[PDB]
Design a protein. Structure first.
Lengths: 133, 49, 584
């Protein structure tokens, strides 16, 4: 697969049509469009099944470059859950001017800059995915 | 009357002084932590390649 | 939490009615509020009624109840006035000295900077109040700039000319070189600067820093910037030395600066002021100081970018190019030195962009334009063994737009210009190389107490003429066309004078003369630092602006060889040691 590909909606629909064709209830690949809690569970089950086919490197925060005061950051503006699909932030602020205490608190907490500024890690002691040191 | 109208205001004045001492201390610590967070962001950005 | 400006006592009380909000101790703030209309005082929290929907803010009508400020109507039964017993309630109430008189601070704080006495008290109070006055004046100027209306491009006839529609309900600025605007580009939901502009009456003639194809929709405002609170004094404590301290003389000097050797040793023997008449070698003085002390690191500072670049020019002809640097903040200036190298041996920068660094000698050129605000930041950004103030109090300082009443003397331009006008200058350039004997002798008796000496002889090409003419006024200037007509008649009979540069104290007079005469035109304020072979001067009025002795000094001292002066004032005409000519 392409390393930069994060939206596998078409593949999810292809698999659902392939194996669960006559399952009457509708299926939402992205749970942001679900109707209530019960539909969220119903679609998250199928996403749980279908997310074991896609590369593990495509799941995680969707980071994006933003400009402030002429200085570019690399900040998280979404997520790609194995269960809930793709979620996009609604209040992404591009070309901002100042960071208040709230914005400084938000940007200092996400793993975007911490992971992007660190060096690569390959830990042979564990099977769990390792991102950075 | 007047001596019991006075020695009970020295307590509230002292309490006010301590409270606004505390609030000033908090407001200085806030500025310190703000500067620390901003400079940390700006120094970790410079390794970005 | 800070230090009382009058007392230096630690205090957390600041006057919220004043635009600068300086710290004031309990007694000081009490006297300041009870004596003026200043009633808003700020503490760690504001002294304002906390009752829902109440507007009582005056310091004397509030009480502390519980943990809050209330008016008399909404106070709880248990309350205590914060304004009583001759002090205002605040931090560190036990530690308080007070002052006998707060009259000077009351005057400086509550004034509007329209009276000459305002600047007099600003330059004659104690150091801390001088700093307060400088910050308050600058903040008042920046706020006054915002009161001006926005001018928007309504039509573009041609290049270098524009049409401006002005905002309703607001005044329009005086259109001249002292009001540098800035264009803005209309975008989807924001605005972007498009450079700094200046306007002049055409339709308006615009001279922006950077050229474009600006169209309808773009607008101009006078850019304001935040005024930062000053801590360092206008002048460091003066100390005199018996030997050379921290400095190591070079043993080989050329005859170019051999005349300056005595003044160079004076700089190294104290913590120093120089008055330099026009065309005397002010840069010639300063650059050799770098040569006279080659192991020394010297910072070069000045108010404007143009003057800073002038110091960069002469260093090119003398100093190493790898040992220098031009500090530029994030206008087109000197771009031959390495940019933004603070640690280099020679530092070239403006006052407003000085980095926090130390050097052996700091030289501040053209001290005339400087104000106490620029003096203080130099001391705050630079800690040096020796400070050299070079300039001329007899030339133009920075314009004072807010001032309308009274005339400003050289002693009040700033704290430095205060010194040589009372106690004299540490160094002085007594030899004028630019002006011929007629011009120098005129200005030597005028403002230099007959101490300026001529290097050139009489040129016999210096004339003066007395002609009132007719005075006409536009929105923000004055025009004397009959004086311009005299110049035209003079030019026909003396065609050799068409290489001259026209000078006048009014921008509108230059504009009319530029079209009629065809000569290059410069205002007296803009002509400081430049030298021309021939100049034609029209006073154009008898107002204080045109009759100012410092301004009349600059206008007539621009001539290399000859000058023609058409006077409306009898006083300055008689003071001109010139060849009188008759009106045709
Ligand atoms: Zn669903
Ligand atoms: Zn005080
Ligand atoms: Zn005040
Ligand atoms: Zn109230």
């Amino acid at each position: 697969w392409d390393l930069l590909k994060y939206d596998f909606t078409e593949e999810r629909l292809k698999l659902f049509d392939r194996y669960f064709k006559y399952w009457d209830q509708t299926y939402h690949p992205n749970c942001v469009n679900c109707l209530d809690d019960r539909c969220i569970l119903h679609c998250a089950n199928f996403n749980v099944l279908f997310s074991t086919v896609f590369p593990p490197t495509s799941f995680g925060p969707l980071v994006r470059k933003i400009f402030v005061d002429g200085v570019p950051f690399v900040v998280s503006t979404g997520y790609h859950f194995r269960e809930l699909g793709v979620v996009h932030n609604q209040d992404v602020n591009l070309h901002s001017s100042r960071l208040s205490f709230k914005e400084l608190l938000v940007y200092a907490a996400d793993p975007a800059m911490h992971a992007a500024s660190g060096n690569l890690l390959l830990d042979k002691r564990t099977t769990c995915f390792s991102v950075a040191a | 009357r007047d001596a019991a109208m006075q020695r009970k205001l020295e307590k509230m004045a002292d309490q006010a002084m301590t409270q606004m001492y505390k609030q000033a201390r908090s407001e200085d610590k806030r500025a310190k932590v703000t500067s620390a967070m901003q400079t940390m962001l700006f120094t970790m950005l410079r390794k970005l390649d | 939490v800070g230090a009382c400006v009058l007392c230096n006592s630690q205090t957390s009380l600041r006057c919220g009615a004043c635009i600068r909000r300086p710290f004031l101790c309990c007694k000081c703030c009490y006297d300041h509020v009870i004596s003026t209309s200043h009633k808003l005082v700020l503490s760690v929290n504001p002294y304002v009624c906390n009752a829902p929907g109440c507007d009582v803010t005056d310091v004397t009508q509030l009480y502390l109840g519980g943990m809050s400020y209330y008016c008399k109507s909404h106070k709880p039964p248990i309350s205590f006035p914060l304004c009583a017993n001759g002090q205002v309630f605040g931090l560190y109430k036990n530690t308080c000295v007070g002052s006998d008189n707060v009259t000077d601070f009351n005057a400086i704080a509550t004034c509007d900077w329209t009276n000459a006495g305002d600047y007099i008290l600003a330059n004659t109070c104690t150091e801390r109040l001088k700093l307060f006055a400088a910050e308050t004046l600058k903040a008042t100027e920046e706020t006054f700039k915002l009161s001006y209306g926005i001018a928007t491009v309504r039509e573009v006839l041609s290049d270098r000319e524009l049409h401006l529609s002005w905002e309703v309900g607001k005044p329009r600025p005086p259109l001249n070189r002292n009001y540098v605007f800035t264009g803005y580009r209309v975008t989807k939901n924001s605005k972007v600067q498009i450079g700094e502009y200046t306007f002049e009456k055409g339709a308006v003639v615009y001279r922006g820093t950077t050229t474009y194809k600006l169209n309808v929709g773009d607008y101009f405002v006078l850019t304001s910037h935040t005024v930062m609170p000053l801590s360092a004094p206008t002048l460091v404590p003066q100390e005199h030395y018996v030997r050379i301290t921290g400095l190591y003389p070079t043993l080989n000097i050329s005859d170019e600066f051999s005349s300056n050797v005595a003044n160079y040793q004076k700089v190294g023997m104290q913590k120093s002021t120089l008055q330099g008449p026009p065309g005397t070698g002010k840069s010639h003085f300063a650059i050799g100081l770098a040569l006279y002390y080659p192991s020394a690191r010297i910072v070069y500072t000045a108010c404007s970018h143009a003057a800073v670049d002038a110091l960069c020019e002469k260093a090119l002809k003398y100093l190493p190019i790898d040992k220098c640097s031009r500090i530029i903040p994030a206008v087109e200036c000197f771009d031959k030195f390495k940019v933004n190298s603070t640690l280099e041996q020679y530092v070239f920068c403006t006052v407003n962009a000085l980095p926090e660094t130390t050097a052996d000698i700091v030289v501040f050129d053209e001290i005339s334009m400087a104000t106490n605000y620029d003096l203080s930041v130099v001391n705050a950004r630079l800690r040096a063994k020796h400070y050299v103030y070079i300039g001329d109090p007899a030339q133009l300082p920075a314009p004072r737009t807010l001032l309308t009443k009274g005339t400003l003397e050289p002693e009040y331009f700033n704290s430095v210009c205060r010194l040589m006008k009372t106690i004299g200058p540490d160094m002085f350039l007594g030899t004028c190389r630019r002006c011929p004997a007629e011009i120098v002798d005129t200005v030597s008796a005028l403002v230099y107490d007959n101490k300026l000496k001529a290097h050139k002889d009489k040129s016999a090409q210096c004339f003066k003429m007395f002609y009132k003419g007719v005075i006409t006024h536009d929105v923000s200037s004055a025009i004397n066309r009959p004086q311009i007509g005299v110049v035209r008649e003079f030019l026909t009979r003396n065609p050799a004078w068409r290489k001259a540069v026209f000078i006048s104290p009014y921008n509108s007079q230059n504009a009319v003369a530029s079209k009629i005469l065809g000569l290059p035109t410069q205002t007296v304020d803009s002509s400081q630092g430049s030298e021309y072979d021939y100049v034609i001067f029209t006073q154009t009025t008898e107002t204080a602006h045109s009759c100012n002795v410092n301004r009349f000094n600059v206008a007539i001292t621009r001539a290399k060889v000859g000058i023609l002066c058409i006077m409306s004032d009898r006083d300055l005409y008689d003071k001109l040691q010139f060849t009188s000519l008759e009106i045709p």
